[PDB]
Amino acid sequence: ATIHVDGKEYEVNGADNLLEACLSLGLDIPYFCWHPALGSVGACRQCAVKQYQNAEDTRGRLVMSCMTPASDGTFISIDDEEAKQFRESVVEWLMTNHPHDCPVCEEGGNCHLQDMTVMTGHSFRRYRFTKRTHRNQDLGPFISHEMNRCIACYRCVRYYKDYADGTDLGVYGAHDNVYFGRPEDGTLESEFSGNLVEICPTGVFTDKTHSERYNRKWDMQFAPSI
Amino acid sequence: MKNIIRTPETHPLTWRLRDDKQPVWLDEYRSKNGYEGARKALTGLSPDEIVNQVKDAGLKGRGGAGFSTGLKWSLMPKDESMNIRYLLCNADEMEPGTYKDRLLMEQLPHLLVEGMLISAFALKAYRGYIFLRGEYIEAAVNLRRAIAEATEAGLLGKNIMGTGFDFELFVHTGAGRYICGEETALINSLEGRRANPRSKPPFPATSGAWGKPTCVNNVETLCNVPAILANGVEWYQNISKSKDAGTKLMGFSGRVKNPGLWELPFGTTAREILEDYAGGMRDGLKFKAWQPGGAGTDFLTEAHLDLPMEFESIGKAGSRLGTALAMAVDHEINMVSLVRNLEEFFARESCGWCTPCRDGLPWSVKILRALERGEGQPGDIETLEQLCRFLGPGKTFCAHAPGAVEPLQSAIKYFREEFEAGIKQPFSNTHLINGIQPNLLK
Amino acid sequence: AFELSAAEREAIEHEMHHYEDPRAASIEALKIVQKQRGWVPDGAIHAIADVLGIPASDVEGVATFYSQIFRQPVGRHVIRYCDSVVCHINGYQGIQAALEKKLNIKPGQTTFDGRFTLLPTCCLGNCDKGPNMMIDEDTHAHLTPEAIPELLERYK
Amino acid sequence: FFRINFSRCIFCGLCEEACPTTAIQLTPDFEMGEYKRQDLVYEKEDLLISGPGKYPEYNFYRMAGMAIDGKDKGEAENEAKPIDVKSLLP
Numbered sequence: 001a002t003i004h005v006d007g008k009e010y011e012v013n014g015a016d017n018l019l020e021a022c023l024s025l026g027l028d029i030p031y032f033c034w035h036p037a038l039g040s041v042g043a044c045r046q047c048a049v050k051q052y053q054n055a056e057d058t059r060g061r062l063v064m065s066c067m068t069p070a071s072d073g074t075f076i077s078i079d080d081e082e083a084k085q086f087r088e089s090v091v092e093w094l095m096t097n098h099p100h101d102c103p104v105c106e107e108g109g110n111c112h113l114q115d116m117t118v119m120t121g122h123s124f125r126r127y128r129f130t131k132r133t134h135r136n137q138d139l140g141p142f143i144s145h146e147m148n149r150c151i152a153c154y155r156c157v158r159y160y161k162d163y164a165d166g167t168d169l170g171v172y173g174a175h176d177n178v179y180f181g182r183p184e185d186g187t188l189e190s191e192f193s194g195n196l197v198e199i200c201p202t203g204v205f206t207d208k209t210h211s212e213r214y215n216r217k218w219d220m221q222f223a224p225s226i
Numbered sequence: 227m228k229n230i231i232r233t234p235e236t237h238p239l240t241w242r243l244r245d246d247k248q249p250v251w252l253d254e255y256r257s258k259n260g261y262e263g264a265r266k267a268l269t270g271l272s273p274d275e276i277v278n279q280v281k282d283a284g285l286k287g288r289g290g291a292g293f294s295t296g297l298k299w300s301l302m303p304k305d306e307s308m309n310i311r312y313l314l315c316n317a318d319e320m321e322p323g324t325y326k327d328r329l330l331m332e333q334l335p336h337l338l339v340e341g342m343l344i345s346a347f348a349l350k351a352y353r354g355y356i357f358l359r360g361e362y363i364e365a366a367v368n369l370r371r372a373i374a375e376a377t378e379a380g381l382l383g384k385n386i387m388g389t390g391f392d393f394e395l396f397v398h399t400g401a402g403r404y405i406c407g408e409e410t411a412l413i414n415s416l417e418g419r420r421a422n423p424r425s426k427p428p429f430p431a432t433s434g435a436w437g438k439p440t441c442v443n444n445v446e447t448l449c450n451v452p453a454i455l456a457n458g459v460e461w462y463q464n465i466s467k468s469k470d471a472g473t474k475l476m477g478f479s480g481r482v483k484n485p486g487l488w489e490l491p492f493g494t495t496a497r498e499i500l501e502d503y504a505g506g507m508r509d510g511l512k513f514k515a516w517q518p519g520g521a522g523t524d525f526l527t528e529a530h531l532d533l534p535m536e537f538e539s540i541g542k543a544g545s546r547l548g549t550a551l552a553m554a555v556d557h558e559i560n561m562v563s564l565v566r567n568l569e570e571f572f573a574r575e576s577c578g579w580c581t582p583c584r585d586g587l588p589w590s591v592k593i594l595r596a597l598e599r600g601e602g603q604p605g606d607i608e609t610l611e612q613l614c615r616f617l618g619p620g621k622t623f624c625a626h627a628p629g630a631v632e633p634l635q636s637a638i639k640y641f642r643e644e645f646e647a648g649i650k651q652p653f654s655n656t657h658l659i660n661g662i663q664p665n666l667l668k
Numbered sequence: 669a670f671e672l673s674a675a676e677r678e679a680i681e682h683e684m685h686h687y688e689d690p691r692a693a694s695i696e697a698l699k700i701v702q703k704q705r706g707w708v709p710d711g712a713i714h715a716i717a718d719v720l721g722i723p724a725s726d727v728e729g730v731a732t733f734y735s736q737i738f739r740q741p742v743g744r745h746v747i748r749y750c751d752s753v754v755c756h757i758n759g760y761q762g763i764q765a766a767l768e769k770k771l772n773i774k775p776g777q778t779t780f781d782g783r784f785t786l787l788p789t790c791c792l793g794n795c796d797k798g799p800n801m802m803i804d805e806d807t808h809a810h811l812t813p814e815a816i817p818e819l820l821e822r823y824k
Numbered sequence: 825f826f827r828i829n830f831s832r833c834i835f836c837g838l839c840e841e842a843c844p845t846t847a848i849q850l851t852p853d854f855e856m857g858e859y860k861r862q863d864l865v866y867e868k869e870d871l872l873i874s875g876p877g878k879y880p881e882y883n884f885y886r887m888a889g890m891a892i893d894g895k896d897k898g899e900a901e902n903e904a905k906p907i908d909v910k911s912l913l914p
């Protein structure tokens with residue numbers, strides 16, 4: 001398939017969506033709810049690009065790149081001003097309720113929400129009202145829970161339930177009080193619950209074992225091991 | 227206007243209503259030409275012929291969007307290996323300002339049952355569900371009684387009228403969310419899930435309830451069906467000289483002399499509805515605004531009152547026809563308080579799925595509360611306008627948020643002076659930190 | 669602590685017969701438990717999950733999604749006054765003030781004797797007869813603030 | 825622990841600028857001469873003074889959503905109280 005991103009011609013797989021095709025080409029599109037292993041649902045509304053009907057089109061339309069097939073002869077723009085403004089607005093809406101927690105958050109320096117906040121260029125708060133808050137649950141010895149930092153990207157439930165077939169994690173509540181956790185306190189029973197700490201783009205689910213002796217990702221000495 | 231004559235030729239939906247506001251049961255319904263269209267459909271017409279008949283009649287969606295019903299029915303798959311088809315009646319009707327389906331189901335339940343029967347035969351739908359809101363208690367009682375009477379009379383169940391067609395009709399009462407009326411979220415709630423909507427394509431006609439072909443239609447569309455099949459296509463096309471065929475339940479509500487509901491042809495102007503049928507505004511009240519089609523439509527002014535109640539004319543004026551149940555706003559109503567109430571409803575009826583609705587409708591609510599208390603700050607109106615622009619069609623997962631920002635758009639467009647009167651404080655979201663000199667932005 | 673009564677179990681299974689998938693009876697199972705006991709307690713989530721064969725997380729998500737499934741104890745009668753825009757024009761605020769001054773509770777609260785719980789609901793689909801109220805199953809229209817102290821005293 | 829190698833430090837102030845709680849502060853004192861270079865490694869007992877320094881009132885924990893003793897959820901600045909998901913209100 002042939003796509004044109006910002007007037008530049010690329011050859012992609014027509015069976016892919018535009019978000020994964022553009023990330024594979026090295027382009028940067030911010031995203032939260034999409035994951036390579038979980039598929040596309042179009043929840044967070046972060047990955048908006050501007051699609052044009054043809055090359056001789058100037059108005060365009062904001063589409064979700066994760067929900068749009070990268071079909072032959074596609075014309076999109078990532079660096080469109082209206083698309084950039086919308087993506088910054090989505091980060092702003094997630095930032096309205098987000099707690100002032102980065103120094104005391106185990107995800108700092110390793111946080112996808114931080115990265116997409118910076119990538120959209122949002123650094124000025126004009127929201128002046130209150131932030132919603134949440135009580136935390138006890139999820140057992142491995143996973144620490146901080147529901148304040150949630151952006152309701154639904155990655156956790158989609159992984160834990162539709163991928164790993166776990167039964168004891170879900171989404172509760174409604175409009176802007178949507179809660180992600182267990183129905184009550186207790187150990188998460190999935191044998192693969194630990195992948196939440198990398199699936200969750202924020203610091204809601206964090207490695208409690210690491211949190212005991214915490215250090216930031218830049219301070220870590222890594223090696224490839226088995 | 228008290229002198230309303232409801233002939234069956236001009237009033238297909240309401241001519242058999244009773245004066246004592248009592249429901250019409252099976253004996254009285256069949257006495258007044260009941261299940262004749264169902265008999266003609268099931269005994270003398272193919273399902274494809276009924277689909278094409280509804281398509282040629284021009285029956286558009288009475289739920290608000292006005293999509294063609296024959297086009298929606300024709301989009302079911304032609305594969306004969308799929309025969310687990312479902313017909314769903316969207317009896318939710320949760321939009322503020324909408325009360326037409328309540329009247330239709332409470333007083334004429336067999337009209338809905340017959341329309342579901344004809345539509346289920348046309349769609350080859352083996353099962354049918356009436357997704358009814360949980361607050362319509364009397365509608366639930368009347369619909370269940372009408373279904374029991376039609377089952378005992380052989381109009382429902384197995385081998386209906388000797389044709390071999392099997393149709394089972396259930397009534398599923400809801401548990402109170404406004405998003406449950408959105409058709410894909412309706413399907414999700416029918417399956418016992420949280421009522422999040424679904425991305426289309428695939429449309430429910432190909433993959434709907436439990437992955438089967440499913441057709442969701444409003445109560446009023448299915449109630450339009452039996453008159454179409456009992457009187458013909460030409461009759462349905464020869465009662466209004468407008469591009470929207472047939473009759474529509476229209477009505478004015480809110481501080482008018484006679485708030486109510488009347489069956490009127492398309493192309494009837496809003497002014498004649500408001501004056502002749504609603505009686506005009508009440509004593510000592512001045513008409514200042516109106517919403518044509520419920521809480522999710524744009525406000526219109528007095529100059530727009532001469533518009534015919536059609537999809538195209540109201541759409542060309544910067545609004546939409548919606549449910550065609552207009553709400554009148556008098557001069558004693560402050561627009562900032564009204565829009566604050568509207569946005570409070572829309573923000574707490576968010577389903578929580580997608581970010582802009584879930585997290586920007588509460589921001590509009592808080593800005594409107596500040597403007598209502600007189601604590602507005604500069605940049606609030608611009609923030610509201612940006613929220614209106616960025617919650618439009620396509621930016622959010624479903625259509626709840628564009629409908630939410632339509633009244634805010636129109637109220638800022640027309641009655642901007644109230645919104646600017648809300649702004650009384652200087653802008654601030656920072657307090658002073660003692661040892662740090664602030665960056666004084668220009 | 670919680671055990672489903674026999675009639676509740678038969679009603680839930682009869683509702684399960686109506687659907688291709690047993691998960692589709694979750695809302696009606698919650699409403700059956702709520703009709704029998706006023707609200708859905710904590711053990712009812714696991715009991716309904718066991719009957720339906722779906723996870724308790726799914727049942728809790730459904731119960732907390734829908735506004736009319738009560739996951740906290742309510743009073744003997746639930747007053748549900750309309751909050752939406754036509755009743756705002758018709759003056760629901762006077763009705764809410766009258767209800768608050770009679771019951772001495774805020775919306776979302778229950779009286780100290782457990783008789784009434786006051787709740788704002790969305791539009792009751794009765795906008796031409798507003799303002800509107802719903803006590804437990806009865807819809808009261810054409811409300812005036814002076815008719816509240818007579819309407820409330822016929823719900824013992 | 826908190827240690828600073830003052831034999832290495834160039835007194836540039838980048839740490840104080842980087843501190844999001846105003847905990848670390850460079851102060852008007854310059855008499856830090858030493859006999860042994862090992863004594864220029866200052867542990868936490870050599871750095872933690874008994875007052876607020878140059879920023880007299882900032883409390884980062886009054887801003888953070890994360891709960892500690894004396895501040896539960898909803899008690900930080902500009903924070904609403906936590907609405908329980910089982911609340912009766914719509």
Ligand SMILES: NC(=O)C1=CN([C@@H]2O[C@H](COP(=O)(O)OP(=O)(O)OC[C@H]3O[C@@H](n4cnc5c(N)ncnc54)[C@H](O)[C@@H]3O)[C@@H](O)[C@H]2O)C=CC1
Nearest residue numbers: 289290291293301319320321324407409429522548549625
């Ligand atoms: N209580 C009520 O009656 C309420 C009504 N509404 C109405 O909802 C409307 C918007 O709702 P939507 O569901 O977004 O309407 P829509 O315009 O997306 O489509 C309406 C119907 O047409 C079908 N459809 C549309 N395009 C199709 C296509 N290309 N192929 C196949 N089927 C297609 C949909 O499946 C649906 O059944 C508004 O106009 C508003 O008036 C909104 C809120 C409450």
Ligand SMILES: Cc1cc2nc3c(=O)[nH]c(=O)nc-3n(C[C@H](O)[C@H](O)[C@H](O)COP(=O)(O)O)c2cc1C
Nearest residue numbers: 287288289316318319320407408409443444625626
């Ligand atoms: C948020 C939202 C709520 C809706 N609520 C209803 C409703 O309560 N009743 C209804 O008939 N349609 C409702 N609709 C419109 C439906 O999606 C759908 O268009 C309609 O129910 C069936 O189409 P029809 O008009 O052809 O019958 C709603 C749409 C949205 C976006």
Ligand code: SF4
Nearest residue numbers: 101102105111202203
């Ligand atoms: S989740 Fe990310 S953005 Fe939120 S407090 Fe933690 S590090 Fe900061």
Ligand code: SF4
Nearest residue numbers: 150151153154156200
């Ligand atoms: S808890 Fe994490 S993974 Fe789940 S919705 Fe919130 S941010 Fe996404």
Ligand code: SF4
Nearest residue numbers: 577579580583623624
């Ligand atoms: S716009 Fe988004 S969050 Fe709002 S009701 Fe629709 S899908 Fe749910």
Ligand code: SF4
Nearest residue numbers: 833834835836837839
């Ligand atoms: S950052 Fe601080 S500790 Fe490091 S050299 Fe600069 S002043 Fe010294």
Ligand code: FES
Nearest residue numbers: 033034045047066
């Ligand atoms: S990544 Fe596409 S909408 Fe979330």
Ligand code: FES
Nearest residue numbers: 750755791792794
């Ligand atoms: S607005 Fe109150 S009944 Fe509709």
